């Protein structure tokens, strides 16, 4: 494939998300850099349409696993980079416990020298005083394990993991992610063995940004295959 | 226009323009939209002469971008040894924290940069520093396969230890480290430790498809029908991923064929949906 070679250095990132949760339409745009060699992301996001109707933590997952650190002994198992530059489709269904669900379709691909994540999100069955639409999720994030599997019959991959958003009053809002990635181009891709990614994240605020924004620092690395 | 040109000169590596722009009224501490200063770009992109020039001109060695990163954080990650030494020589905070809480030592250990680790230790790096997810530079080295760094960090100075996602050494060993599993269990590792998602080492082993590890876990008392907050049992996982021998062993040790995941499927149903015709067949004799 040779698509992994497009990530040997720092890559500019562009994120564009048109969302719609219970008719509350909104748009997000993000920009920054990704460094696959060290699985690092340095991004800042903005709600281009004003106040974001849902908490920023819920969109972190939706808002480029191709920038995950795959060590040399796992090069064979990096589907994300293997589908580049044509890219891959990333579809998810995020079920929040005792609340509604997101549904996302992303086209992650290269447009020039920039890796662009263009997303379309739709949320339904959400409760106006729930943890999401009621803004009870704290502005932090947790470390998660992301379990990756080759597709049920050999075209792309599937990914499942449970996100855990902290709630102001102590409890936790789970979010079952049922992810499904498929390559856009017809070229060859790497179908990996079962493994996992170990994620880190830090949400913060630019003190000079008066808009609704999310400063994101994120470290990710694959693991689970050796020798 | 000087700030943008100085940032672009320090980025491109053009020490020609840096001293020209500084001879003009260029602010050495210019910062872009994100808090990146000419010293960040010179440090990250391996431009030693520019680092020395900027620091000589009064560049803030400890300037922090929006993500809390300093030129030392970037130099330690990018693996630029001399730049790290110079930064440390000019008053760089050896234990500055990025937004995740990484110190330069974490990043060097994360990035597999031994000589950086040695330098940072020599300049006073806190080997016991934890990021905001509980990981020490050692743990980060471990999780990334940086053995020598882990060996150096441990030397710099609980088999049931558990990180912020509930993973114990047995969870990490379950991914194809048989001898490690045997040692940990022999030393008293809790064979039924459930992580944050409710997964036990037997879940991970069945998911990873390591027969030997599954057998050892079972002969050490592993709950073959584990399912607290997990949503599956090891028999479900083994049936999803076509691990026939795993299914044989799990059944032999009392796996429940009628167990239902949180979607209502039995291991038979999962084997049917995944085309595992053999597993479905022997699961039919129940």
User: Which domains, from first to last, does chain B contain?
Assistant: 1-93 (1.25.40.20), 96-157 (1.25.40.20), 158-286 (1.25.40.20)
Contact residues on chain A for B131, CB-CB shorter than 8 A: 200
Asked if B144 has any chain A CB less than 8 Å from its own CB, the reply is yes
**A23-27 long-range CB contacts below 8 Å, 24 or more apart?**
A24/A53, A24/A54, A24/A133, A25/A49, A26/A50, A26/A52, A26/A53, A26/A54
Which tokens belong to B104? 């330069």
E-only strand ranges, A51-87: none
Q: CA B283 to CA B286: how far, in whole Å?
A: 5
Helix, strand, or coil (residue A47)? strand
Pairwise CB contact (< 8 Å): A194 & B207: yes
E-only strand ranges, B4-59: none
- Is domain A1-227 given the CATH code 2.40.155.10 in the classification? yes
Burial of residue A25 (CB within 10 Å: 0-12, 13-18, 19+) is exposed
- Closest CA of chain B from A146, distance in Å: 11
User: What is the structure's resolution, reported in angstroms to one decimal?
Assistant: 2.5
Q: CA B175 to CA A119: how far, in whole Å?
A: 33
Which tokens belong to A83? 């589908």
Rounding to the nearest 10 degrees, give the CA dihedral for residues A189, A190, A196, A199: -50
- The dihedral through the CA atoms of B172, A190, A159, A142 has a sign that is positive
Asked if B131 has any chain A CB less than 8 Å from its own CB, the reply is yes
Rounding to the nearest 10 degrees, give the CA dihedral for residues B95, A198, A99, A156: 140
8 Å CB contact between B48 and B82: yes
Which residues are CB-contacts of B1 (< 8 A; sequence separation ≥ 6)?
none
Q: CA B230 to CA B226: how far, in whole Å?
A: 8
Question: Could you tell me where the DSSP H helices lie in chain A?
Answer: 79-82
Helix, strand, or coil (residue B155)? helix
Pairing mode, if any, of strands A10-21 and A24-35? antiparallel
Pairwise CB contact (< 8 Å): B101 & A202: yes
Rounding to the nearest 10 degrees, give the CA dihedral for residues B254, B257, B261, B264: -160
- DSSP annotation of A185: S
DSSP notation for B66-114: TTS--HHHHHHHHT-HHHHHHHHHTT--TT---TT---HHHHHHHHT-H
* Placement of tokens 């936790």 in the chain: A172
């Amino acid at each position: 494939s040779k698509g992994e070679e497009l990530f040997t250095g720092v890559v500019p990132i562009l994120v564009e998300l048109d969302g719609d949760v219970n008719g509350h339409k909104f748009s997000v745009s993000g920009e920054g850099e990704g460094d696959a060699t060290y699985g690092k992301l340095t991004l800042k996001f903005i709600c281009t349409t004003g106040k974001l109707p849902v908490p920023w933590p819920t969109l972190v997952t939706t808002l480029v696993q191709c920038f995950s650190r795959y060590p040399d002994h796992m090069k064979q198992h990096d589907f994300f980079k293997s589908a580049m530059p044509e890219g891959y489709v990333q579809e998810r269904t995020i079920f929040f416990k005792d609340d509604g669900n997101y549904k996302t379709r992303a086209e992650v691909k290269f447009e020039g020298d920039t890796l662009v994540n263009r997303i379309e999100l739709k949320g339904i069955d959400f409760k106006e005083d729930g943890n999401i639409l009621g803004h009870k999720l704290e502005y932090n994030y947790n470390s998660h394990n992301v379990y990756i599997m080759a597709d049920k019959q050999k075209n792309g991959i599937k990914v499942n993991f449970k996100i855990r958003h902290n709630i102001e009053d102590g409890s936790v809002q789970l979010a079952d992610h049922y992810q499904q990635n498929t390559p856009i181009g017809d070229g060859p891709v790497l179908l990996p063995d079962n493994h996992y990614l170990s994620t880190q994240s830090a949400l913060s605020k630019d003190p000079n940004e008066k808009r609704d924004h999310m400063v994101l620092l994120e470290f990710v690395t694959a693991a689970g295959i050796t020798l | 226009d000087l700030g943008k040109k100085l940032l672009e000169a320090a980025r491109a590596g053009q020490d020609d323009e840096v001293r020209i722009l500084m001879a003009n009224g260029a602010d050495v501490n210019a910062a872009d939209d994100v808090g990146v200063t000419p010293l960040h770009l010179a440090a990250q992109r391996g431009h030693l002469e520019i680092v020395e020039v900027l620091l000589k001109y009064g560049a803030d060695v400890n300037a922090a971008d929006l993500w809390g990163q300093t030129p030392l954080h970037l130099a330690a990650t990018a693996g630029h040894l001399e730049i790290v030494e110079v930064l440390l020589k000019n008053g760089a905070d050896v234990n500055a924290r990025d937004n995740i809480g990484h110190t330069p030592l974490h990043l060097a250990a994360w990035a597999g940069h031994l000589e950086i680790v040695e330098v940072l230790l020599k300049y006073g790096a806190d080997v016991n520093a934890q990021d905001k997810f509980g990981k020490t530079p050692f743990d980060l080295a471990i999780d990334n396969g940086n053995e020598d760094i882990a060996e150096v960090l441990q030397k710099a100075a609980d088999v049931n230890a558990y990180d912020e996602v509930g993973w114990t050494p047995l969870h990490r060993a379950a991914w194809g480290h048989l001898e490690l599993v045997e040692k940990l269990l022999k030393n008293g590792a809790d064979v039924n430790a459930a992580d944050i998602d409710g997964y036990t080492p037997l879940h991970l082993a069945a998911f990873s498809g390591h027969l030997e590890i599954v057998e050892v876990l079972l002969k050490y008392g592993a709950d073959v029908n584990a399912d607290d907050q997990a949503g599956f049992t090891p028999l479900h996982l083994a049936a999803i991923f076509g691990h026939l021998e795993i299914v044989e062993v799990l059944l032999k040790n009392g796996a429940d064929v009628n167990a239902q995941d949180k979607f209502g499927k039995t291991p038979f149903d999962l084997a049917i949906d995944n085309g595992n015709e053999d597993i479905a067949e022997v699961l039919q004799k129940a």
